[PDB]
Amino acid sequence: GLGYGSWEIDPKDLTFLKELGTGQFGVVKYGKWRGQYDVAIKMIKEGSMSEDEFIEEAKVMMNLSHEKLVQLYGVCTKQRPIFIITEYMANGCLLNYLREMRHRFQTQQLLEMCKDVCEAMEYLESKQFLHRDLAARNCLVNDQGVVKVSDFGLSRYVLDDEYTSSVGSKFPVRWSPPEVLMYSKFSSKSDIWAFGVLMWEIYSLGKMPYERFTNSETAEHIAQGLRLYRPHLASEKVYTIMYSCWHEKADERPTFKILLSNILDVMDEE
Template sequence: IFYLILLLEMCKDVSEGMSYLEDNQYIHRDLAARNCLVDSNGTIKVTDFGLSRYVLDDEYTSSVGSKFPVRWSPPEVLLYCKFSSKSDIWAFGVLMWEVYTLGRMPYDRWNNTEIVEKITAGHRLYRPQLANDKVYSIMNSCWHEVHSLY
């Protein structure tokens, strides 16, 4: 039971970091477990701001052909290159999935083209074994938050 509390605590730390970014009008655009570090107290810190953007209207459209993390991206990014705090929320749901699968690669059996096809058709990641229904409903709510944008 202790490790389940630890997994939830990790997700909470990331959500607080992402809330701080949104409050300060930044879109991370590359939120994933690989871009989080653990400090000496066991607190998770969001890092790697190479793709981050400061935005005034909570939206950033990247140029066609730009690289972005397909496995962590919502339909409006995959189809229209439109990023917002909502696309960071989607990525947070995928990060939660990574945490609760103990580091599995999202959509590990699909290539980028297949991922785009499946995500835009409505496919979502399955419930990890370690995630109870309540935790999985949080993940799912992250993946449904964005639809109003496209």
């Protein structure tokens, strides 16, 4: 309506129901839009985000639509704090979900989670859109157990320098290829590397990558050509897939289309 662009949601249409959790931008709540439609409401902590830049990018993100990507519905702007309104994912963050041993996952379920993420990422790749911070902590799980990729591209708007410099205390060292660690070379192939680490997180039931090492030790390990090794729950074929994401030479790493084909092959074989 009148004072709202297509990317803008009227916060007055929101009913707040429950708190879901917190992230690096702050608190996330479950609510309803216009009394009926489930939404997640990300309340963006003051000073945490480059907001004008994010809002311009929201216009682009509005048009990214794929069943395995957490949908952006709009933004509540020109208020303090701003809200990001997204698809509601009732089972919360993938990392926490993996760590709950009650689920007693079959490896077929783990492979399906990898396929869900790979489909989202193949779509993003087809749009030349980098995630830039792919990891289990940035995947969500809905009430049907479907995994979807969340917060794609959002690291570009984070004002905390501890997160954004490869040297920073909060940079995702453990999800980064050598060329990112060494000279900040981001590309489709840094997303591919991260995807490999994510498969490792899934098959490891949410263990931290390089769990015995500091970030500094991890960077040394990786730069010296060494890698994560096979999670107990990963078959030889599944391990081959994740390991292919970690070629020292970025151009030798697969595309998400190729990874998707390889995952489907293993699903048919296993």
